[PDB]
DNA sequence: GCGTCGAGACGC
DNA sequence: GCGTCGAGACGC
DNA sequence: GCGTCGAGACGC
DNA sequence: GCGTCGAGACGC
């Protein structure tokens, strides 16, 4: 049971999820893709998978079909925001069309 | 009920509670007294009352004798740390001996 | 609300 | 001296 | 009127 | 700390 801060830092470091990435060499700012499910540029591995990994690794309930979209992602974002090691600092749209949130590691 | 950010800002503004005060004229940083109950400098009106006001005004559970110490303050501080409009940024001690936490209004 | 740490009163 | 057990503050 | 997001009170 | 469930605003 690692801290949320350490958990997310390892996920970003891993490079396992496209768009879940550092902005800087100093690794103080990271992006979390948040493209709506209804958007034509939603991509599962980018916008959906991390949320599922959060709920499988941290959640305390069975991971059923209701998590095939963004349910786990919503839960994960709430976890990141309420962590004192992190702080949402902005958001944007990439030139490839996808939506992201920006967090800073304190 | 007001948002928790609006709730605490109003409490600080009000000057009801000694030590529950702004650090700056710009009202971006406030202090919450957190002197421990068994510390020789503990003063109810400063270190205890606000926490009980939190429980009375925000909670739904009976306000019994269990809140005659720092239980309410504890629940309040947790709520303050978790709210997205606020960030705990420090801690201090004053010349009268009391301890405080510092929050920034974002 | 529990887990870790460990006050200080106690036994020898 | 140095063991016992485990206050009340605080991290989780 | 429902779906997504996610307030903040709660348990431990 | 960090899970639970799910306010009321808003997109659909």
Structure characterization notes:
- Chains A, B: This is K9.
- Two copies of one chain form a homodimer.
- Chain A has 106 residues and is α+β, with helices and mostly antiparallel strands.
- Chain A has a single domain, classed as Arc Repressor Mutant, subunit A, CATH 1.10.10.
- The first copy, chain A, has three helices and four strands.
- Chain A has helices spanning 4-14, 44-57, 71-81; strands at residues 21-22, 29-33, 86-93, 99-105.
- Chain A has a four-stranded antiparallel sheet with strand order 1-2-4-3.
- In chain A, helix 2 (44-57) crosses helix 3 (71-81).
- The interface between A and B is small, with 5 and 5 residues.
- Chain A binds four DNA strands through helix 3.
From the structure above, extract its key features.
homodimer; 106 residues; alpha+beta; Arc Repressor Mutant, subunit A; 3 helices; globular; DNA-binding; K9 (chains A, B)
């Amino acid at each position: 049971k690692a801290s949320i801060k350490d958990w997310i830092v390892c996920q970003v470091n891993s490079g396992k999820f496209p768009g879940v990435e550092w902005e800087d060499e100093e690794r103080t700012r990271f992006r979390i893709p948040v493209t709506p499910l209804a958007d034509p540029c939603f991509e599962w591995r980018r916008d959906g998978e991390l949320g599922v990994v959060y709920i499988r690794e941290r959640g305390n309930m069975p991971v059923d079909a209701s998590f095939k979209g963004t349910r786990g992602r919503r839960r994960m974002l709430a976890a990141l925001r309420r962590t004192r090691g992190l702080q949402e600092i902005g958001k944007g749209i990439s030139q490839d069309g996808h939506h992201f949130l920006v967090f800073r590691v304190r």
